[PDB]
């Protein structure tokens, strides 16, 4: 039953004051309030939850906030109480992240509505259909990449998706698509043996004898699999974990790490800070 | 290099504003801000870190904050950058929590100075001395419980300690001393899944798969009152009773250490009969 | 591709020898091997996995193991490689544990087959039907408790279920049913405030200010909610968790704790040891 | 009050039988038994705890084991009930791992005796003396790397140490000394989400990592690589500046080294090709 207000701007004196004084004048009751000023990047970040007053003027509240935010170079986002982001999940053949996200959605852990599942293969259509989520198979003609991506983007625009989740979508995103999805597409990949580009990175992990397998959830930008880190995690493994078992634990940590990231994002907790994230 | 300001007051529209607007008027540069408004207890809590301005008038800041607060019924605490709380640790025969606290103090993980170890027994004297910390053995005469507690309170006062840690001190505090220490005395005890002679032996027989510990502030309710931190340690069938007791010590050490850390970092607030930890 | 062999007997010299020597003679290749001798209870426990030989005489292997076990008073259980326990899940109105178990079943985390969902209410039928699992609503007539339980027990018998999971089934089991289900029915309940019998235990935990909420999975016997502990766990909570949030964390820890217990049981890991369990 | 027997040999039908039937014939009462057959390396590993019989012939047990093992190519180690490994800790200027190891030893958590602290610098002498442990400062003459290592290796032999712990010892060991300490020297270093060169924590700060980690391993010719015993990580966030990351770095180095030393001294670690099995 609370509104969420996120704000960010160049560090200066009065950055908490300008949000806090305006919220008081507007008779908005602060239920909780978290903020961070990064002394290296020079950026200020604030998350505030509040209970609206009766006769709440949303339009005039935004406009009055836009006015005061000008002096600070401040940008803000305001999210209503019942807000459920519309999401598009992109999938290839691996169904583990898709299954986990839809399960967490269904039990009410992730307060989002998945409006489509988009794929380069037809394989996961039965899974999407069982969940009653519209499924789209846009096969790639290698000669025409922009054509495949226009169809993907068309679904994202037609459904009004405000977040795209890459749940082990294996087709490489063009640089034009990456710019188009900037700041609202979350990807997940494993983080085994940093700096090993072999086709069997889990067999390589087994042979090296690691005692952990890892994963990173990040925002998409032009750097392949890099770009802003949202969440990282590891799963304990041991000698009795053969390659298939290691692959299996990898799927677990991908699942968990992606869900955490997606949760942080939809809860309005994640901010971009130069090339990294603050999570409040 | 940063000051810490904590505020606690009844919930009202503009409780954040009173602190933040004041901080802004005083040219105190805020580096981070955490707050919580408890809708059940009707209390608002805020913890703020800030960098002082050049030529910071500390008396004028405190004075200017006390005037703004009277209108809100607000209680604040302002802690300077280099502040290290003076601490008295009370012990009986068990050394696990004292060892763990003095170790964490020595390596810089708990920013405090242990000015005294007080005990109702002589046994841990050598340990306190090896660490070069004054040790006080105030024996109990069962007739004169107020007499022993008078000596304990003298040391706490003379050393000027602002925190008392009961690191498995096994003599019951009186209602009078409990009142005196309300809000700045931290105790640790075990938490199992039992009530009698051998609690760990009863855990073993019941077949529990965890042992736990609770750190809390002291009040008149024995081993209850305001909870600061709780934790558990995984155990299995291979843990015999003595292994169980050993794990119990580990989790008492870790949980107490956490709670002491929260307290000295100015993160704990009393909220009716519980705590908020920011 | 491995057989599972579990044995237990009164403590004596040569308890590991009698199983290990017999596995050698039978040309059963041990892949891994765990044992424990409880010095307080006087009980020995062994779990062994092996690869069978070509032309594996299962009947005569059991018979010859039965023969040698006599001197030790040893009981054993032998599980074929591909074995998937048939399971009946019992439910009332809380759907969180049922959703969790069926999700974990479907993704292959729990190698079991749920052959029925049995209920004292009609509410969770749609959830069972969506998974294509037969559902049974056996309403209770307070005058005829043995009548409701005969129907439950009939379903368990007819489906050939070898494990029953009480996934927040709230109807009290009779002592007759408890004896009947002894050693193969697993229950889950919260472990909030030991020895507080009030109707709102999570509101009581809130007011008292706990920083953890807990759960216990146990085998069913005549002692209500007590009886052999298989698994216990806790979830961190804090001051910002109101009662409903705490109740929600309770569900999480009930889900995880039950699933670990059920996993231990179906992997042939759990032994009864006097009034407690050994998990190898 | 229990003996510990570890064995490893090539994988064959009857590897468990040879140890267990022997233990039985010798009236060794088995209290706990864990084994693993690695189907990729072709090696079998077993760790058994047992209670000795009255009037236990230790020479006759070891001898009779050695005879049965001949037909299996089997290596075994038998540790007496109250055995406390003699340990040498090597250190440079960083005191976090040394502090943590000496604290854990003093409180009974690591059942070992630190017989010596050896260093390439004099800085941590007071720390070792406070614990009443012999401290040795052997400065490096860069023209005589064999000269410094001869004095280090002397202390290790004279003290009779069976474990060397490199507690952030920063001098590069020679292939000769590495070869010498194979399977009984444990080293600790950091592991990141992976940053070549100057200021790895500053690089990790800029990259926005959300964990820092560490790796305890046995020492061989490959620098900061060689058989991994234990790994762990510590959660970090945006509020951790570079020097906060360094502090967390230290924490996880401490925890990870202590776990690995613990596994080693409890006879739970086995070499398995270029890896470890931890039972």
Coordinates of N, CA and C in Angstrom, one line a residue, chain B residues 36-41 191-193 204-210 212-213 223-225 227-232 237-238 240-241 243 271 273-278, chain C residues 36-41 191 194 203 206-212 215-216 226-227 229-234 239-244 273 275-280:
Chain B
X36 N 13.5 3.7 9.2 CA 12.4 2.8 9.3 C 11.3 3.4 10.2
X37 N 10.1 3.3 9.7 CA 8.9 3.8 10.5 C 8.1 2.6 10.8
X38 N 8.1 2.2 12.1 CA 7.4 1.0 12.5 C 5.9 1.4 12.7
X39 N 5.0 0.8 11.8 CA 3.6 1.1 11.9 C 2.9 0.5 13.1
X40 N 3.5 -0.6 13.7 CA 2.9 -1.2 14.8 C 3.2 -0.5 16.2
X41 N 4.5 -0.1 16.4 CA 4.9 0.5 17.6 C 4.8 2.1 17.6
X191 N 20.0 -21.3 22.6 CA 18.7 -21.4 22.1 C 18.5 -22.7 21.4
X192 N 17.7 -23.6 22.0 CA 17.6 -25.0 21.5 C 16.1 -25.3 21.1
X193 N 15.9 -26.5 20.6 CA 14.6 -26.9 20.1 C 14.0 -28.0 21.0
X204 N 20.7 -33.7 22.2 CA 21.3 -34.9 21.5 C 20.2 -36.0 21.5
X205 N 19.6 -36.3 22.6 CA 18.5 -37.4 22.6 C 17.3 -37.1 21.8
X206 N 16.9 -35.8 21.7 CA 15.8 -35.4 20.9 C 16.1 -35.4 19.4
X207 N 17.4 -35.4 19.1 CA 17.9 -35.5 17.7 C 17.9 -34.3 16.9
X208 N 18.1 -33.1 17.6 CA 18.0 -31.8 16.9 C 19.1 -31.7 15.8
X209 N 18.9 -30.9 14.8 CA 19.8 -30.7 13.7 C 20.4 -29.3 13.6
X210 N 20.2 -28.5 14.7 CA 20.8 -27.2 14.9 C 21.0 -26.9 16.4
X212 N 21.5 -23.1 18.7 CA 21.3 -21.7 18.5 C 21.8 -20.9 19.6
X213 N 21.8 -19.6 19.4 CA 22.2 -18.6 20.4 C 21.4 -17.3 20.2
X223 N 17.0 -13.8 30.9 CA 17.4 -14.3 29.5 C 16.3 -14.0 28.4
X224 N 15.4 -13.0 28.7 CA 14.5 -12.5 27.7 C 14.8 -11.0 27.7
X225 N 13.8 -10.2 27.3 CA 14.0 -8.8 27.1 C 14.5 -8.6 25.7
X227 N 15.7 -8.5 22.2 CA 16.6 -9.3 21.3 C 17.3 -8.5 20.2
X228 N 18.6 -8.7 20.2 CA 19.5 -8.0 19.2 C 19.9 -8.8 18.0
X229 N 20.3 -10.1 18.3 CA 20.7 -11.0 17.3 C 20.5 -12.5 17.7
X230 N 20.2 -13.3 16.7 CA 20.0 -14.7 16.8 C 20.7 -15.4 15.7
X231 N 21.1 -16.6 15.9 CA 21.8 -17.4 14.9 C 21.8 -18.9 15.3
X232 N 22.1 -19.8 14.3 CA 22.1 -21.2 14.6 C 23.4 -21.8 13.9
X237 N 23.8 -36.2 13.6 CA 23.9 -37.4 14.4 C 25.3 -37.7 14.9
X238 N 26.3 -37.3 14.2 CA 27.7 -37.5 14.6 C 28.2 -36.6 15.7
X240 N 28.0 -35.8 19.2 CA 27.7 -36.3 20.5 C 27.4 -35.1 21.4
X241 N 26.9 -35.3 22.7 CA 26.7 -34.2 23.5 C 27.8 -33.2 23.7
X243 N 30.3 -32.6 21.6 CA 30.4 -31.9 20.3 C 29.3 -30.8 20.2
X271 N 12.9 -0.6 20.6 CA 11.6 -0.3 20.1 C 10.6 -1.2 20.9
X273 N 9.6 -3.6 23.4 CA 10.3 -4.7 24.0 C 11.2 -5.4 22.9
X274 N 11.5 -4.8 21.8 CA 12.4 -5.4 20.8 C 13.4 -4.5 20.3
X275 N 14.2 -4.9 19.2 CA 15.1 -3.9 18.6 C 14.9 -3.8 17.1
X276 N 15.3 -2.6 16.6 CA 15.4 -2.3 15.2 C 16.9 -2.1 15.0
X277 N 17.4 -2.8 14.0 CA 18.9 -2.8 13.7 C 19.0 -2.2 12.3
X278 N 19.6 -1.0 12.1 CA 19.7 -0.4 10.8 C 21.0 -0.5 10.2
Chain C
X36 N 28.2 -45.3 10.0 CA 28.2 -44.7 11.3 C 27.8 -45.6 12.4
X37 N 28.6 -45.7 13.4 CA 28.3 -46.5 14.6 C 28.0 -45.5 15.8
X38 N 26.7 -45.5 16.2 CA 26.3 -44.6 17.3 C 26.6 -45.2 18.7
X39 N 27.6 -44.7 19.4 CA 28.0 -45.2 20.6 C 27.1 -45.1 21.8
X40 N 26.1 -44.2 21.7 CA 25.1 -44.0 22.7 C 23.9 -45.0 22.5
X41 N 23.4 -45.1 21.3 CA 22.3 -46.0 21.0 C 22.7 -47.4 20.7
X191 N 8.6 -24.0 13.6 CA 9.2 -24.2 15.0 C 9.4 -22.9 15.7
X194 N 8.9 -22.3 20.7 CA 8.8 -23.6 21.4 C 7.9 -23.5 22.7
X203 N 2.3 -13.6 15.1 CA 2.1 -12.3 15.7 C 2.8 -12.3 17.0
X206 N 6.5 -11.8 16.1 CA 6.7 -10.4 15.8 C 6.8 -9.5 17.1
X207 N 5.9 -9.7 18.0 CA 5.9 -8.9 19.2 C 7.1 -9.1 20.1
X208 N 7.7 -10.3 20.1 CA 8.8 -10.7 20.9 C 10.1 -10.3 20.2
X209 N 10.1 -10.1 18.9 CA 11.2 -9.5 18.2 C 12.2 -10.5 17.6
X210 N 11.8 -11.7 17.2 CA 12.7 -12.7 16.8 C 13.4 -12.2 15.5
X211 N 14.6 -12.8 15.3 CA 15.4 -12.5 14.1 C 15.5 -13.7 13.2
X212 N 14.8 -14.8 13.6 CA 14.7 -16.0 12.8 C 13.3 -16.6 13.0
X215 N 11.5 -24.2 11.1 CA 10.7 -25.3 10.7 C 11.3 -26.7 10.9
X216 N 10.5 -27.7 11.2 CA 10.9 -29.0 11.4 C 10.2 -30.0 10.5
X226 N 5.8 -34.0 17.3 CA 7.1 -34.5 17.7 C 7.2 -35.8 17.0
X227 N 8.2 -36.7 17.3 CA 8.5 -37.8 16.5 C 9.7 -37.5 15.7
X229 N 12.9 -36.4 14.1 CA 13.3 -35.3 13.4 C 14.2 -35.7 12.2
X230 N 13.9 -35.3 11.0 CA 14.7 -35.5 9.8 C 15.5 -34.3 9.4
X231 N 14.9 -33.1 9.4 CA 15.6 -31.9 9.1 C 15.0 -30.7 9.8
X232 N 15.8 -29.7 10.0 CA 15.3 -28.4 10.6 C 16.1 -27.3 9.9
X233 N 15.5 -26.1 9.8 CA 16.1 -25.0 9.2 C 15.5 -23.7 9.7
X234 N 16.2 -22.6 9.5 CA 15.7 -21.3 9.8 C 15.9 -20.3 8.7
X239 N 13.2 -6.6 11.8 CA 12.2 -5.6 12.2 C 11.2 -5.1 11.2
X240 N 11.6 -5.1 9.9 CA 10.7 -4.7 8.8 C 9.8 -5.7 8.4
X241 N 10.0 -7.0 8.8 CA 9.0 -8.1 8.6 C 7.8 -8.0 9.6
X242 N 6.7 -7.5 9.1 CA 5.5 -7.5 9.8 C 4.9 -8.9 9.8
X243 N 3.9 -9.2 10.6 CA 3.3 -10.5 10.8 C 3.1 -11.3 9.5
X244 N 2.5 -10.6 8.5 CA 2.2 -11.3 7.2 C 3.5 -11.6 6.5
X273 N 16.9 -44.2 14.4 CA 17.9 -44.5 15.4 C 17.3 -44.2 16.7
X275 N 14.8 -42.9 18.8 CA 13.7 -41.9 18.6 C 14.1 -40.7 17.7
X276 N 15.3 -40.9 17.0 CA 15.9 -39.8 16.2 C 16.3 -40.4 14.8
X277 N 17.0 -39.6 14.0 CA 17.4 -40.1 12.7 C 18.9 -39.8 12.5
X278 N 19.5 -40.8 11.7 CA 20.8 -40.6 11.2 C 20.6 -40.4 9.7
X279 N 21.3 -39.4 9.1 CA 21.2 -39.1 7.7 C 22.6 -39.2 7.1
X280 N 22.8 -40.3 6.3 CA 24.1 -40.6 5.7 C 24.3 -40.0 4.4

